[PDB]
């Protein structure tokens, strides 16, 4: 009912999300710029957990 029509998006509501510029913007002939040092992930730091893993293995020998 009203919920379905409000949740659904009319194709006419936007201009079909039209892009900027009539044609695609030009680019450099190479323009590689690899970057991509991080791909998603991140969040919790690796150094702290790595030190925790080192303490974990030491604790495992300590439990022995």
């Amino acid at each position: 009912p009203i919920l379905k029509r409000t949740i659904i998006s009319k194709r006419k509501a936007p201009s079909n999300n039209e892009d900027e510029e009539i044609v695609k913007t030009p680019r450099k002939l190479v323009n590689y710029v690899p970057l991509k040092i991080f791909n998603l992930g991140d969040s919790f730091d690796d150094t702290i957990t790595t030190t925790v893993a080192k303490l974990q293995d030491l604790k495992k020998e300590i439990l022995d």
Binding site: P1, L3, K4, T6, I7, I8, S9, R11, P14, S15, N16, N17, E18, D19, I22, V23
Partner: protein, 294 residues
């Protein structure tokens, strides 16, 4: 029994925590149903956005393809006009070669006529010297003829220059037309390859647009609509209105839903702690509480 009642009082908090955790699990299931019973909001929004961007890319690509297809015909017309100009260049080169041949033949014939006149004058001089060993009139006539031939060759001089100037002129224009044709074939070939690449990109965009629709997610759709229609509105409408209010207040449709889903899964991870027995412990606690005064 009082110590057991104290333990039951200690675990009553755990039972209430399990009951509230189950209630929160029911609320989490209700929040999941809010997007599961209806069409998935994140997926529908992503599908609408991708369909809109694909449709606009298809529209710009088809508009560009129509524009290039309409513009291509004048290039064919210009190539036909340039080939007509090449036929004009061939006629101009042929007429210039004809004029050069005629001028060279005429100057060579004039030079040969001057040589024949010189030979005739030398023959008349041999006749004159043999006579010395009419002639004056013939010599005067030959001198007048040779001076007339010198005047004619002087007139042919600069006429040959005008022929050379007219040969070089109007030939540079045909050379420019040949250069225009040489540039035209290369640029039309480049435009043909560019339009072929644009048409290939347009076909790829059409394939992407076709793939955007008739998806397995779309097959899942119209079944979630039936599932929502199984229970129409009532409590579901109220919870849906509350969810819509929360979504618009959060100013997010994808990150907010994922954050709420992660939070509710984390909350449900610690659930069902000692929930196996809820009524028997309360009943025995009530029975022991009634037994204590006796």
């Amino acid at each position: 029994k009082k110590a057991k009642i104290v333990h039951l009082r200690q675990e009553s908090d755990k039972l209430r925590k399990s009951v509230e955790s189950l209630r929160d699990f029911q609320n989490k299931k209700g929040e999941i149903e809010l997007h599961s019973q209806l069409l998935p909001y994140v997926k529908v929004k992503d599908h609408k956005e991708k369909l809109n961007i694909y449709k606009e890319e298809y529209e710009r690509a088809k508009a560009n393809l129509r524009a290039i297809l309409k513009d291509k015909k004048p290039f064919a017309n210009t190539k036909k006009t340039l080939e007509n100009q090449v036929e004009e260049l061939t006629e101009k080169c042929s007429l210039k070669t004809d004029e050069f041949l005629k001028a060279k033949e005429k100057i060579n014939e004039i030079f040969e006529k001057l040589n024949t006149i010189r030979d005739e004058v030398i023959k008349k001089k041999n006749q004159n010297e043999y006579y010395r060993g009419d002639i004056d009139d013939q010599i005067q006539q030959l001198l007048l003829k040779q001076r007339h031939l010198l005047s004619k060759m002087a007139s042919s001089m600069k006429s040959l220059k005008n022929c050379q100037k007219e040969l070089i002129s109007t030939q540079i224009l045909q050379f420019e037309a040949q250069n225009m044709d040489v540039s035209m074939n290369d640029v039309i070939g480049f435009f043909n390859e560019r339009e072929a690449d644009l048409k290939s990109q347009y076909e790829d965009k059409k394939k992407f647009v076709k793939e955007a629709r008739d998806t397995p997610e779309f097959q899942s759709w119209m079944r979630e609509i039936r599932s929502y229609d199984q229970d129409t509105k009532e409590k579901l409408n109220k919870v849906a209105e509350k969810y819509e209010e929360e979504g618009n207040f959060n100013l997010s449709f994808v990150q907010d839903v994922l954050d709420k889903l992660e939070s509710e899964i984390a909350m449900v991870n610690h659930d069902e702690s000692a929930v196996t027995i809820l009524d028997q412990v309360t009943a025995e606690l009530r029975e022991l509480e009634h037994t204590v005064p006796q």
